[PDB]
Amino acid sequence: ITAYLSRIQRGGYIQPFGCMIAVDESSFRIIGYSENAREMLGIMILAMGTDVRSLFTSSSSILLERAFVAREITLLNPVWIHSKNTGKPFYAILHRIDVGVVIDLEPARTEDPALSIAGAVQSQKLAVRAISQLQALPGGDIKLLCDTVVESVRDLTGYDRVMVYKFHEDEHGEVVAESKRDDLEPYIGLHYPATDIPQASRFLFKQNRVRMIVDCNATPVLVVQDDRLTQSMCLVGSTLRAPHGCHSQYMANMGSIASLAMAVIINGSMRLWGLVVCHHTSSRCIPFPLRYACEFLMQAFGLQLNMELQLALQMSEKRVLRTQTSIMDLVKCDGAALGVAPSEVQIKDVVEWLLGLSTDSLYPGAAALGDAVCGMAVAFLFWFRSHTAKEIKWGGAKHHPEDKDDGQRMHPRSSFQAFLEVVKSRSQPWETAEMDAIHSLQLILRDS
Amino acid sequence: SVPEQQITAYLSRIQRGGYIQPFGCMIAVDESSFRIIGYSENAREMLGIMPEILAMGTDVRSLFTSSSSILLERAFVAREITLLNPVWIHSKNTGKPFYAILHRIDVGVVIDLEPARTEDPALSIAGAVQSQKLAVRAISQLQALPGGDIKLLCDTVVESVRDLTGYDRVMVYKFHEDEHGEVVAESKRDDLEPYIGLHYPATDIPQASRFLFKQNRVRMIVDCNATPVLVVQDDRLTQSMCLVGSTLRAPHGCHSQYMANMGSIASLAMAVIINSMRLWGLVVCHHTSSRCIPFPLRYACEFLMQAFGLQLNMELQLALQMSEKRVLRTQTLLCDMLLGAAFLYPLXXXXXXXXXXXXXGLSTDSLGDXXXXXXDAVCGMAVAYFLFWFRTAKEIKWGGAKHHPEDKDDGQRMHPRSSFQAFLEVVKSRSQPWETAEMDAIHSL
Ligand SMILES: *[C@H](C)[C@H]1/C(=C/c2[nH]c(/C=C3N=C(/C=C4\NC(=O)C(C=C)=C4C)C(C)=C\3CCC(=O)O)c(CCC(=O)O)c2C)NC(=O)[C@@H]1C
Ligand SMILES: *[C@H](C)[C@H]1/C(=C/c2[nH]c(/C=C3N=C(/C=C4\NC(=O)C(C=C)=C4C)C(C)=C\3CCC(=O)O)c(CCC(=O)O)c2C)NC(=O)[C@@H]1C
């Protein structure tokens, strides 16, 4: 039913910057492994049914033995594991799927433990501090929140470009705030079609809230599984999951070799309001502690943003109902029949034509008298409403409302160059609550 | 909340008690030079320094490994030490692992040493992320929470802390307007009896404690009956050291005996803060047996309590907005439709004469406190001048003693109550409280 779903969830390819080993929870037998595992572990004795504890040191062995039995595996991540052959350190990110226990081995850049530990502690500390700074911001100012959070996230991660990508009502997105590198060109203010980010990706982002991609140009690695498995494994929770081909070529064409997307969650029962994407001109990999730290920071961001939204909304409605009982500051309309509205001529003509009504695009005759008068509300009072922003700067493509997603499509667009668009002469779409208030007010005026 | 300078009760002894809990060592060390200016009595015992190595005026860095030593050195010169807690430390000879919770005081720096479980170095990395991990999970339990409800928040949070730590009882204690508290939600052990619904006097928690919980948001007591440990400090020190932030700070005797009497041999209090900040209440934990939880869990719980604080603040503001929206929309509604409560049309004469004699907008809780109307159906009322509103008896359960408005904290008092037997008090001659929103709405009519 959902496009790209099974292809992202159970796509038998992982990123080549690390290796992955899928184990049977009850028998500790290997039921899956990526082809780069043998090379990365320096095995040059790894097959289907090989005891995992034989691949690593005995301490690591009994440690992961403790890990499998545990009520919650996530609490032991990451497991610092040494290899039998090489002796090089690996971060072990364990999680559970419907088949067994998946182990994500990510090579550790620092070899001496003290420096790595100090780095992790430093990262967590920087996350706590970033959140603390994020808490002291004045309320109501969401733009300041997003700017300070892209500056913070950029300061922590070190990516050349960091930005907040807001999902609008019609599922089309918009970079609302960014902290790019100075010499890089601004992607801020741009708009993108809804098909750039499929519903499947947004759903999986609601479930999995942090996704790292080290290199789009890097050749994906096929993970071979035991022939006894009914279907291809669920590599959603895997931090090494290779991106879909279309998004790989997408990142390739956009100039983002290394990506990192985090979810922005509110509620309406959770809802994905937007993302915070990070693009790097070159390829880079950040360790697990930094990633989890960023997930925490993004959790705080999601909470605070949710608060701001709720409070601003209820306060807005409260302000409407309070101003109801200054006439001009009642609704968002520019004209009220006084205000952004012509003389009694166009009024006479419109009234002449009128003999519950509301439109967002104004009746060709008197609609060319002014660019302001485009929205009409009739119920005896008349409401004029100004037209929307007549220019939208898209990033290579326009969001077509009747355009949907299909799993067979596996090739993106060629360029994301900013191009302007003149939307049809329309006013801002009249809300339903506004019309209900118009009815209530109509009854009120009918009484007296 | 209350002003800082007005609080005088228990403060001097709570801050500088000179007594710590016996589950961890405590060493106060000068900042410039790492010489010891203070140390607990049992400090030599847990570190295996018992026969000198540890004494007044000895380099504390020589009491641990060089790695732990330079960790401390970089901790002292940090921007803010509180962000480096806990500092992992190994002993010099016994090699015993310790969580070091550091606090910068007026003169020197207090170092709390908590005995940690010997874990494999391979988990060290996994150990570094633990606090934020537990915190992320617990808060994630709050993210998937339908906004609007205030009870489900406290319930799910209480349950979250219940599963996080492992206490036999976890609950939310809320401070009312007259400083007296009430248990709003709890996750008792199925065996135990519920403390839910019953209130407490304001003198149960002194102003000093509530004030102190602002700067120190987490407090753990592994055992009240455990014999406190005297801290030995230098002779040159003018006064007792400021153990206001120590995680080992022994409870003031009255609260220890309080815990003993209530049955809570193990306590864990976490303050919740909303919006110059305000203490809304605490989240307290009780255990039938002794319970010492590691510092990372207390940190995670602190995060969870910040999240809970902000979220609850949001819920409060939303609730206010909704209520105001309701009374306002009803106001406009009736105002439009026009163009028990008495309108001078009940929905008699003696009450009118009494009102004419008393008026020689008002809000009265007790008419006896016009005495004629007292001769209970018309408990209290609100007068608008000529419209009148007549409201009223709600029962309140107390857990041992009633809170009187004459109750004041006594700094010299050192003995708590004996019984917390839940008794029920009904209230007459005190009608339904005329809220600010209600009275302002009436005045706006
Ligand atoms: C294929 C023909 C179609 C397609 C498929 C597709 N896209 C994704 C995931 C993402 N797409 C994103 C789009 C942007 N990237 C940006 O930098 C910006 C703006 C500055 C946009 C709008 C983003 C973001 C994602 C998620 C990032 C991540 O790391 O996951 C996927 C899912 C792949 C996966 O494996 O998760 C797929 C299948 N996108 C297209 O544009 C065409 C139409
Ligand atoms: C002594 C004569 C008076 C007294 C002193 C006192 N109380 C505290 C601290 C707390 N008291 C609390 C009350 C409760 N605990 C509960 O579990 C419940 C209900 C279920 C209540 C109402 C709480 C909570 C605290 C804070 C906990 C903590 O660990 O600090 C103190 C300060 C203690 C310290 O840290 O030194 C003192 C001096 N309490 C009394 O009731 C009598 C009147």
Alpha helices in B43-108 (DSSP H): 43-46, 66-76
Residue in B425, B136, B166 with CA at minimum distance from that of residue A262: B136
- With H, G, I as helix, E, B as strand and everything else as coil, classify residue A426: coil
What lies within 8 Å, CB to CB, of B231 at 6+ separation is B18, B19, B20, B26, B28, B38, B39, B40, B41, B241, B243
Q: What is the DSSP string of B129-141?
A: SHHHHHHHHHHHH
Structure tokens at B347: 């929905």
- Distance from chain centroid for Cα A179: 17
A434 sits in which H/E element: helix A432-447
Q: Is the dihedral of CA A112, A114, A115, A121 positive or negative?
A: positive
- A218, A292, A273: which is closest to A251 by C-alpha? A218
Burial of B330 (0-12, 13-18, 19+ CB in 10 A): exposed
Cα gap A153→B438, rounded to integer Å: 46
**Residue A442: C-alpha distances to residues A317, A353, B328, B336, B376 (Å):** 19, 20, 19, 12, 45
Which residues partner with A275 through β-bridges?
A165, A263
Burial degree of B225 (CB within 10 A; 0-12, 13-18, 19+) = exposed
Amino acid code (one letter) for B28: A
Look at the block and give the residue holding tokens 């997930």: A295
In terms of CA atoms, which chain A residue is nearest residue B125? A117
Length of chain B: 445
Tell me the angle at which helices A113-135 and A288-324 cross, rounded to the nearest 10 degrees. Answer: 10
Pairing of strands B199-200, A270-280: unpaired
Alpha carbons within 13 angstroms on the beta-carbon side of residue A417 total 3
Given a contact cutoff of 8 angstroms between Cβ atoms, the answer to whether A430 and A360 are in contact is: yes
Show the tokens assigned to B176: 């009312």
Label residue A38 left, alpha or beta by phi (over 0 means left) and psi (-120 to 50 means alpha).
alpha
Residues 6+ apart with CB under 8 A from A364: none
**Which residues have CB under 8 Å from B371's CB, separation 6+?**
none
Closest CA to ligand 1's atom 6: A247
Is B99 in contact with B294 (CB distance < 8 Å)? yes
Cα gap A275→A204, rounded to integer Å: 12
Query: Which chain B residues are within 8 Å of A304, Cβ to Cβ?
Result: 310
C-to-N gaps above 2.5 Å in chain A, after residues: 44, 268, 325, 337, 355, 362, 379
Cβ atoms within 10 Å, residue B94: 11
Q: Is A261 in the pocket of ligand 1 (CB under 6 A)?
A: yes
In angstroms, the CA A170 to CA A35 distance is 42
Residue A205 dihedral angles phi and psi, to the nearest 5°:
-80, -30
Resolution for this PDB entry, in angstroms: 3.4
C-alpha span between A12 and B183 (Å, rounded): 53
CB burial of A147-175 (b: ≥16 within 10 Å; e: otherwise) equals: bbbbbbbbebbebbbbbbbbbeeeebbbb
Would the CB atoms of A296 and B131 count as touching at under 8 Å?
no
Q: Where are the domains of chain A?
A: 1-18+112-334, 19-111, 335-448
Joined tokens for residue A225: 């599984």
- Is A266 close to ligand 1, i.e. is its CB under 6 Å away? no
| CA within 13 Å, CB half, B141 | 21
Provide the residue type at A145 as one letter: L
CA-based torsion, A192, A195, A198, A202: positive or negative? positive
- E strands, A28-132, where? 30-34, 79-82, 89-96, 101-107
Instruction: Judge whether B62 and A107 are in contact, CB under 8 Å.
Output: no
Residue of chain B whose alpha carbon sits nearest to that of A128: B83
Pick among A105, A129, A307, A441 to test the B interface (most B CBs inside 10 A)? A307
Size of interface A-B (CB pairs under 8 A): 133
Indicate whether residue A187 lines ligand 1 (CB < 6 A): yes
Name residue B25's beta-bridge partners.
B113
Alpha helices in B179-281, H assignment, sequence order:
207-215, 253-262
Q: Is there a contact between B128 and A113 if contact means CB atoms under 8 Å apart?
A: no
Beta-bridge mates of residue A359 = A376
Q: How far apart are the first and last CA of chain A?
A: 55
For residue B55 the two structure tokens come to 């004494």
- C-beta atoms of B314 and A315 within 8 A: no
Q: Which of A157, A143, A39, A50 is nearest to A88 (CA)?
A: A39
Q: Under DSSP, is residue B250 helix (H, G, I), strand (E, B) or coil? A: coil
User: Which ligand 2 atom sits closest to the C-alpha of B264?
Assistant: 17
Q: Which amino acid is at B59?
A: D
Q: Which residues in chain A have their CB less than 8 angstroms from residue B444's CB?
A: none
Residue B228 CB less than 6 A away from ligand 2: no
Number of alpha carbons in the 13 Å side-chain half-sphere of residue B76: 18
Under an 8 A CB cutoff, do A314 and B322 touch? Answer: yes
Q: What is the CA radius of gyration of chain A?
A: 28
Interval between CA B204 and ligand 2 midpoint (Å): 5
Residue B149 CA, ligand 2 centroid: distance in Å: 29
Per the DSSP assignment, residues forming a β-bridge with B270 are B218, B283
Q: What angle do CA A72, A76, A81 make, to 5 degrees?
A: 140
CB spacing of A293 vs B132 below 8 angstroms? yes
Cβ–Cβ under 8 Å, residues B309 and B240: no
Secondary structure of residue B351 in the 3-state scheme: helix
Gap from CA of A196 to ligand 1 centroid (Å): 5
What is the distance in A from the centroid of ligand 2 to the CA of B180? 12
Method underlying the structure: X-ray
Q: Which residue carries 């990372």 as its tokens?
A: B296
Give the mutation candidate from A83, A264, A298, A321 for the B interface (greatest B CB count, under 10 A). A321
Partner residue opposite A128 with nearest CB, options B83, B125, B144: B83
Amino acid identity, position B385:
Y
Residue with tokens 């050291």: B241
B336 contacts A447? CB cut-off 8 A = yes
Structure tokens at B161: 């802390």
CB of A158 closer than 8 Å to CB of A287: no
Coarse DSSP helix, strand, coil percentages of chain A, rounded to the nearest 5 percent: 35, 25, 40
Q: Report the alpha-carbon distance of residue B147 to residue B101 in Å, rounded.
A: 36
Q: Do B132 and A325 touch (CB under 8 A)?
A: no
Q: Which residues of B414-430 are buried (b: 16+ CB within 10 A; e: fewer)?
A: eebbeebeeeeeeeeee
| CB A266, CB A302: distance < 8 Å | yes
What's CA B339's distance to the chain center, in Å? 51
Residue A431 is classified by DSSP as P
Would you say B278 and B177 are in contact if contact means Cβ atoms under 8 Å apart? no
Which strands form B266-274's sheet, in the order they lie side by side?
A: B218-221, B266-274, B278-287, B169-175, B181-186, B199-200, B396-399, B422-425
Write the DSSP symbol of residue B323.
H
DSSP H or E run through A336? strand A335-336
Coil/strand/helix, residue A424? coil
Rounded distance between C-alpha atoms, residue B117 and residue B99, angstroms: 10
3-class state of residue B442 by DSSP: helix
Instruction: Name the residue with tokens 């952004």.
Output: A340
Residue that the structure tokens 């999240």 belong to: B307
Instruction: Assign B333 to helix, strand or coil.
Output: helix
Distance of CA B166 to the CA centre of its chain: 19
Residue with tokens 């007044």: B56
Q: How many CA atoms lie within 13 A of B238 on its CB side?
A: 3
Cβ count near B80 (within 10 Å): 10
The angle subtended at Cα B163 by Cα A297 and Cα B294, nearest 5°, is 70
d(CA A358, CA A356): 7
User: Would you state the structure tokens that stand for residue A412, as one six-digit string?
Assistant: 């993106």
Taking alpha carbons only, the member of B92, B89, B93 closest to residue B102 is B89
- Residue B81 CA to residue B77 CA, distance in Å, equals 8
Angle at A397 between CA A388 and CA A409, to 5 degrees: 135
Query: What's phi and psi for A192, nearest 5 deg?
Result: -135, 150
Q: Are B161 and B285 in contact (CB under 8 A)?
A: yes
Instruction: Name the DSSP class of B122.
Output: G
Q: Using the 8-state DSSP alphabet, how is residue A186 labeled?
A: P
What whole-number distance in Å separates Cα of residue B417 and Cα of residue B204?
9
Q: Is the CB of B284 under 6 A from ligand 2?
A: yes
Cis ω before A243 (30° cut-off from 0): no
The single-letter code of the amino acid at A278 is C
Strand order in the sheet with A270-280: A210-213, A258-267, A270-280, A161-167, A173-178, A191-192, A392-395, A418-421
- Asked if B25 contacts B36 with a C-beta cutoff of 8 angstroms, the reply is no
The DSSP bridge pattern shows strands B36-40 and B25-29 to be antiparallel
Alpha helices in B5-102 (DSSP H): 11-15, 43-46, 66-76
Burial-class residue A203 by CB neighbours within 10 Å (0-12, 13-18, 19+).
middle
What phi and psi, each to the nearest 5 degrees, are found at residue A316? -65, -50
CA distances from B360 to B356, B374, B381, B383 (A): 7, 20, 17, 13
Q: Give the CA-trace dihedral at B199, B204, B207, B209, to 10 degrees.
A: -110
User: How many Cβ atoms are within 10 Å of A385's Cβ, its own excluded?
Assistant: 29
CA distance A377 to B66: 78
User: What DSSP designation does A111 have?
Assistant: -
Half-sphere exposure for B180 (CA within 13 Å, toward CB) = 17
The side-by-side arrangement of strands in the sheet containing B341-343 is B341-343, B387-390, B381-384, B362-364
Distances (CA, A) of B365 to B178, B346, B351, B380, B429: 16, 20, 16, 5, 7
Which DSSP string do the residues of A347-406 spell out, in sequence order?
HHHHHHHH--EEES----SGGGS-SS--EEEE---EEEE-B--S-EEEESS---TT----
Extended strands (E) in B116-248 = 169-175, 181-186, 199-200, 218-221, 229-233
**Strand pairing class (A89-96; A101-107):** antiparallel
Cα-to-centroid distance, B50 and ligand 1 (Å): 64
| Cα B270 from Cα B284, distance rounded (Å) | 6
Helix (H, G, I), strand (E, B) or coil at A228: coil
Q: Give the position of tokens 């001048």.
A: B385
B53 CB burial (10 A radius; 0-12, 13-18, 19+): middle
